[PDB]
Design a protein around this ligand. Structure first.
Ligand code: NAG
Lengths: 211, 87, 87, 223
């Protein structure tokens, strides 16, 4: 009936100012939409930030401030901190119900950025023997935790059979993820080559293998 | 001039019993201003007080729109008796 | 419950009060509120000081007869104060 | 401080119905309205309904009319949400979010609960099938080499994966589990020096408490 759109993910440095937007599909976000901003820490933690008309949740830092820049809602962090790195959801009120957005994955860099260490694993002969063969693509040590993983079979992009986990935080505040490819036994034997493409920031790493 | 306009509004099928149209099916937004003239007869026994005030409400009814800004017609028209609008 | 200055609402009840009249039998509902009065004031404003006043009137008995300024003062003073309480 | 402790996670089969609690503490319970938000994997955060502890009045999302039922016990300071006719779609984590204004609807989220994970699957308990995976031949691994295990087709969660019975606990990567057609599948990888492989044995230990399974698998070098 109506969809709320946010940015996929945004990156900022400690001390600087970042602005998260919240666009409505029905038109301009007016004041009767009661723009709400919710922060999601890892391990399914949630907290309110800015709500309704000019209300603020108890304990919300002064650096957080809401507004209506342009024709959409805005969440501005003036003087970002390391602990401000989380997922930020915006919710809009259509009188009958609330509608959340896709959520923005805000990254505040506490360390220099890191390229992903990607490795590709062929389906084991023990698993290849019966049922379904599975390609595994482990992604490690990338920061920010935003990666786009594409698959290629015989040079052609695979629209079906691929699945990838959500980037989980590592011990050194980096991120890791895994991608799986579901195929039938006879399918794997036929094709010449397989490939796992991982997109981090603006670069692209490629891992491939045959037979 | 004004009487010439008010008639034109209510010649079309208009219903003051019907909520004004919205661009996206949303609610009617009423902007409210308040003017307090007097506060008197504060009662502590009956837990009440008398207050006289001027209420100002404002909303948009596109059904009542009779013009564009760049016309020879007056920005606003005072509503005369005998014509009901949704309130 | 705090809205009432004189009383404190203790209980509310919903009952039926259907009665038979000369014109017929009419169904009836009855909401009932029970009001208790604030006792703490009258206690600390009237009962307590007057009880002490009666006690003070007794200590004139323990005074000697020759102490006219002692017994006469207490007697008249205690009585005059009690009058103010009543008013 | 205030807290919104909800009930623990539950696992039920399609057709049934259960009720999630949300015990409040640290504030006047009757003063703040409670929201209920559904966080699924396939779909975004979906607001369900709100309920006013004072009036008992409720307002539901049209999407969840009849699917959810909000009640409230003022005595124990607890909010309840009953979900009826549970299906595979209703499998998600449910949060209770407090409104921020005192005895009035301010339309803004204050505090949230820890969340309640509700899994509604028509699956029987399945022991994990463990398949190894050996590195590729064409690469330059001057420093170290990466190997791992693949746990496939287990139900329900969780499963614990260790390496060399705990001897190798530094270097492990246990990735999140995915739902591949009613069954769960995850993979754990450990990065060890190329000098220590395959000279020294590296086995994969996988435990599944829900089926009392503890199978091992040694990694074997690939041609
Ligand atoms: C209402 O409460 C009062 C005491 O405050 C009591 O006398 C009365 O019986 C109560 N009514 C009922 C039906 O419980």
């Amino acid at each position: 009936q109506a969809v709320v759109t946010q940015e996929s993910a945004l990156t900022t440095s400690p001390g600087e100012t970042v602005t998260l937007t919240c666009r409505s599909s029905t038109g301009a976000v007016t004041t009767i939409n009661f723009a709400n901003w919710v922060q999601e820490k890892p391990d399914h933690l949630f907290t309110g930030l800015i709500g309704g008309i000019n209300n603020r949740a108890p304990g919300v830092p002064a650096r957080f401030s809401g507004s209506l820049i342009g024709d959409k809602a805005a969440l501005t962090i003036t003087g970002a901190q390391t602990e401000d790195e989380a997922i930020y959801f915006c919710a809009l009120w259509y009188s009958n119900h609330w509608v959340f957005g896709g959520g923005t994955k805000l990254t505040v860099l506490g360390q220099p950025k890191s390229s992903p260490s990607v490795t590709l694993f062929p389906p084991s002969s023990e698993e290849l023997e019966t049922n379904k063969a599975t390609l595994v693509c482990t992604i490690t040590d990338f920061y920010p935790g935003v990666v786009t993983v594409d698959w290629k079979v015989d040079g052609t992009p695979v629209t079906q059979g691929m699945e990838t986990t959500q980037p989980s935080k590592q011990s050194n505040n980096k991120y890791m993820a895994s991608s799986y490819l579901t195929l039938t036994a006879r399918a794997w034997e036929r094709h010449s080559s397989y490939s796992c493409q991982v997109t981090h920031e603006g670069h692209t790493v490629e891992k491939s293998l045959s037979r | 001039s004004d009487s010439k306009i008010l008639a034109h509004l209510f010649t079309s099928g208009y219903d003051f019993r019907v909520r004004p149209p919205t661009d996206n099916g949303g609610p009617v937004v009423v902007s409210v201003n308040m003017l307090l003239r007097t506060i008197s007869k504060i009662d502590v026994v009956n837990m009440e007080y008398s207050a006289q005030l001027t209420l100002r409400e404002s909303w948009i009814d596109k059904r009542l729109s009779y013009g564009v800004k760049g016309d020879g017609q007056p920005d606003f028209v005072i509503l005369t008796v005998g014509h009901q609008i949704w309130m | 419950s705090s809205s009432l200055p004189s009383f404190q609402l203790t209980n509310t009840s919903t009952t039926y009060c259907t009665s038979v009249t000369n014109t017929g039998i009419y169904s009836c509902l009855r909401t009932t509120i029970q009001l208790k009065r604030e006792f703490s004031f009258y206690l600390l404003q009237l009962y307590i000081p007057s009880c002490m006043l009666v006690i003070v009137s007794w200590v004139s008995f323990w005074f000697d007869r020759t102490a006219i300024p002692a017994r006469v003062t207490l007697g008249v003073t205690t009585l005059l104060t009690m009058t103010a309480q009543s008013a | 401080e205030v807290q919104l402790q909800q009930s623990g996670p539950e696992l039920v089969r399609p057709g049934a119905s259960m009720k999630i609690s949300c015990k409040a503490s640290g504030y006047s319970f009757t003063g703040y309205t409670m929201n209920w938000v559904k966080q699924s994997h396939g779909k975004n955060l979906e607001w369900i309904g709100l309920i006013n502890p004072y009036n008992g009045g409720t307002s539901y999302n049209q999407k969840f009319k009849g699917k959810a039922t909000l009640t409230v016990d003022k005595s124990s300071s607890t909010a309840y949400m009953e979900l009826l006719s549970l299906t595979s779609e209703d499998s998600a984590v449910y949060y209770c979010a407090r409104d921020g204004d005192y005895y009035r609807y301010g339309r803004y989220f204050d505090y949230w609960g820890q969340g309640t994970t509700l899994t509604v699957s028509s699956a029987k308990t399945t022991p994990p099938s463990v398949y190894p995976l050996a590195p590729g031949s064409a690469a330059q691994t001057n420093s170290m080499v990466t190997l791992g295990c693949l746990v496939k087709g287990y139900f329900p969660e969780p499963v614990t994966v260790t390496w060399n019975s705990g001897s190798l606990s530094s270097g492990v990567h246990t990735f999140p589990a995915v739902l591949q057609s009613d069954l769960y599948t995850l993979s754990s990888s450990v990065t060890v020096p190329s000098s220590t492989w395959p000279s020294e044995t590296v086995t994969c230990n996988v435990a599944h408490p829900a089926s009392s399974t503890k199978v091992d698998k040694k990694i074997v070098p690939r041609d």
